Amino acid sequence: FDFNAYMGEKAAAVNRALDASIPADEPPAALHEAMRYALLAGGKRVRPALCLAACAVVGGREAWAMPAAAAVEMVHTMSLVHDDLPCMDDDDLRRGKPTCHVVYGEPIAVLTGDALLSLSFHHMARFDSYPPDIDADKHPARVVRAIGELARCIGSEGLVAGQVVDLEMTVPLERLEYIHLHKTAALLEASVVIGAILGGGSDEQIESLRMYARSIGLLFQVVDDILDVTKTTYPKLLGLEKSREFAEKLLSDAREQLSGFDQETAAPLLHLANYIAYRQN
């Protein structure tokens, strides 16, 4: 198993689906260009990869979950487009490239966020988004459950709640944990859970995957804080060494949540967890 090759092939496939989801030749042009600019501006596609890998680990075909992989990346992008607004965060650049509101203006950026959010649901709900070999009997209820999970992870019980609390703005540990679980972990949770649902996973499998996702979700942000402090965060509260220990515990917990799966089949998730833990950027 070659993880870099895996990440490359999944990111390539996901970018293809994303590019195909938005026409570059229809009005209004500014909207479609803003959407494609925001969505096709590269990215490691970690959330779509989690989705496909969770579909695979429960015994599904990855193509069954491709619309959802695309959807969670649309949702992630939307969250970036809105977080970057001058009223919030106020970022002119992302990586080395100017943000959506810089290129297209704030009105177009707000609207681009809304259209991406809408598109995620539209794309996941079209039966023609899925391959012809889906289970015709079971698939509709799976789609409903997945839509419910994505929506639940985005709103006042997930992403937006975290954004709101982070906006209110030293922060106690419980509140920091809240913000990270909602602003970061919720959408990872949705990625793997939706993947497992569409793959036909059992409730038992889905709940193990959910616990895995919550651990790597927190881990993602703890490692983010650690890297940012080396270049309110967990090291500001607990110190760098306790932060590293906590990260270690989260990684170990996540890997342990998969002990019920065939470890060959769970290799992508195991490797994804490693990847999340050991980033250096």
Add this chain to the structure above:
Amino acid sequence: GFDFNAYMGEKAAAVNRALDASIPADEPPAALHEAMRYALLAGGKRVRPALCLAACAVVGGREAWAMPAAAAVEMVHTMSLVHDDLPCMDDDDLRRGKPTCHVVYGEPIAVLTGDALLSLSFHHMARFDSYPPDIDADKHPARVVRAIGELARCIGSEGLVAGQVVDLEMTVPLERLEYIHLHKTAALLEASVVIGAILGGGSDEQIESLRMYARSIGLLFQVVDDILDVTKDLASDKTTYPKLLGLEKSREFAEKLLSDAREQLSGFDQETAAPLLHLANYIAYRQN
């Protein structure tokens, strides 16, 4: 015969109960919940939920089957207002005599409140427990998927948002004016009746007739608004049907839209279709 004012009153009451119940009163992210509740429960005549419930009724379903979607469309409607009122967009400080969401809660909270309402509409329509126990367990999932797709479609770059983007781009030709109105007004009306009909177990033929009904009354609404403005910010404000057509041709067009709306419903039980017929009349002959 039929008392439209009473009908609107009972449906608005029922919808308001569902909406109030959709968002917790004291759940931990309080500012957000309060803001959502403020935006969503600040009155309104609830025409879109009523369209949804009436469409479920006319195809032979129970109105309760469509209540979650009714709630959902009002959330989407609210979301659009919340985002439209923003200073970078329409810059409105008041909406129907009440301070807008961003005035009371600030711009960040208004943007996020919009986002949260949009997601709540889908969350709410997808929960199996949102629906009454007597739904068809075999067919209901595929209907919910289809309705969710229609709802999403009416929001994004093929509907509401496309219309707002175009309306912002700033005299306008008739094609662009109708484009703007079809996307900013008709799309969500169409989604309301289409979703209602889907969840009600309506046929493809019934669904498409209701869709055309909604397109016609959506256009009719904006045409009548322009006429009333003559008898009594954006591209659709500056450019009007009477400026393009003259007042008399505008009135003729309104009459044609009304007759079309009424004809789209000719295949339904006219008693069950009463709320829709009377709604079309209300839209055509109102004076404000």
